[PDB]
């Protein structure tokens, strides 16, 4: 279990949003805080990603690019896990200082997106996902969205991604005998992983739209979130970068 040792070792800790819970739950303040949270989580994603097995093998610009495309899905997925483990998915556990109850979901003007995240969160319970399955799935999300005309070194990305797939299939297989079980489970998890993309994409639209009208609406975007949402997000919205699904939509 060397591969799991590593995933378990490099797993980031609690990251706080910095939200002043004394302030009244407004849109402006809810969204600026989610944005600061994003920026803070980004630092930890960079650090986690570079320590993943095989990751520095990728061309250096490709390293930056896969992080910059996939962050939304990584963070959304980890947030659902957190939500599942700390609050049985009843609310959205963005951070220990930024838990969204129903009121906050309405106030953030994202209610239907949060509903979709809460569903994603509950799949962890419905499927009885293990911490091992979770870590390997999250690692595979790093490798699940790319430009349609390839990366700088695509051949290396393809072998790497294949190895992560092999690893998740292992994590399922150290466990079971009579083999419809292992087939159903791999099916279940590839389906779950696919389900992160449409949600990620809603949040891409929303944050983009938000950044456009941000000065009109008193929502702050920190430097890195501003740059990524203006330079890389639109490549996704314009279909120059697309998720890699397991099953056709
Ligand atoms: C099917 C297969 C292929 C190679 C292999 O070797 C182990 C190396 N390895 C890598 S390097 C990925 C390719 C690249 O950087 O261009 N990443 C791994 C992740 C998990 C386990 C081994 C990994 C093993 C099997
Ligand atoms: C992108 C965004 C800020 C960062 C948020 C994102 C919602 C999903 C999310 C979950 C996290 O746990 C980290 C912060 C992020 C990544 C937010 C939706 C709109 C807002 O602008």
Structural topology:
Blueprint: H1 2-10, H2 27-50, H3 60-87, E1 92-95, E2 98-100, H4 102-107, H5 111-126, H6 131-141, E3 145-147, H7 154-173, H8 180-212, H9 223-231, H10 233-237, E4 241-243
Antiparallel strand pairs: 1-2, 3-4
Helix pairs in contact: 2-3, 3-5, 3-6, 3-8, 5-8, 6-7
This protein binds ligand YLQ and testosterone.
Testosterone is lined by residues 31, 34-35, 37-38, 41, 72, 75-76, 79, 94, 203, 206-207, 210.
Verbal overview:
There is one protein chain. The protein has about 250 residues and is mostly helical. It has a single domain, classed as Retinoid X Receptor. The chain contains ten helices and four strands, in the order H-H-H-E-E-H-H-H-E-H-H-H-H-E. The chain is globular, with a radius of gyration of 18 Å. The structure holds the ligand Cc1ccc(OCCn2c(SCCC(=O)O)nc3ccccc32)cc1 and testosterone.
What is the count of structural domains?
1
Class derived from helix and strand content: mainly alpha
- CATH superfamily assignment? Retinoid X Receptor
CATH topology: Retinoid X Receptor
| Terminal CA distance | 34 Å
CATH arch. level architecture: Orthogonal Bundle
Overall geometry comes to: globular
Please give the count of helices.
10
Rg to the nearest angstrom? Answer: 18 Å
Strand order of the largest sheet: 1-2
Into which percent range does the helicity of residues fall? Answer: 55-70%
**Order of helical and strand elements:** HHHEEHHHEHHHHE
User: What ligands are attached or bound here?
Assistant: ligand YLQ, testosterone
Reported for the largest beta sheet, the result is: 2 strands, antiparallel
Beta-strand share of residues:
5-15%
Number of strands: 4
Classified by CATH, the class is Mainly Alpha
PDB class: hormone receptor
Keywords: hormone receptor, binding function 3
Assembly: monomeric
Entry title: targeting the binding function 3 site of the androgen receptor through in silico molecular modeling
């Amino acid at each position: 279990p060397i591969f799991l040792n590593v995933l378990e070792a490099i797993e980031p800790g609690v990251v706080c949003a910095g939200h002043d819970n004394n302030q009244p739950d407004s849109f402006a303040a809810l969204l600026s805080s989610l944005n600061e949270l994003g920026e803070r989580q980004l630092v930890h994603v960079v650090k986690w990603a570079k320590a993943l097995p095989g990751f520095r093998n990728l061309h250096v610009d490709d390293q930056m690019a896969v992080i910059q495309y996939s962050w939304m899905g990584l963070m959304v997925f980890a947030m659902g896990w957190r939500s599942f483990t700390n609050v049985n998915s009843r609310m959205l556990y963005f951070a220990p200082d930024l838990v969204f109850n129903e009121y906050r979901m309405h106030k953030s003007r994202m209610y239907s997106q949060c509903v979709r995240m809460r569903h994603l969160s509950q799949e962890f319970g419905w499927l009885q996902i293990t911490p091992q399955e979770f870590l390997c799935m999250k690692a595979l999300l790093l490798f699940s969205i790319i430009p349609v005309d390839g990366l700088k070194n695509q051949k290396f990305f393809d072998e790497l991604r294949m190895n992560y797939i092999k690893e998740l299939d292992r994590i399922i297989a150290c466990k079971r005998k009579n083999p419809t079980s292992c087939s159903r489970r791999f099916y279940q998890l590839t389906k779950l992983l696919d389900s992160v993309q449409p949600i990620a994409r809603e949040l891409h639209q929303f944050t983009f739209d938000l950044l456009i009208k941000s000065h009109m609406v008193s929502v702050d975007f920190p430097e890195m979130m501003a740059e990524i949402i203006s330079v890389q997000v639109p490549k996704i919205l314009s279909g120059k970068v697309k998720p890699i699904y397991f099953h056709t939509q």
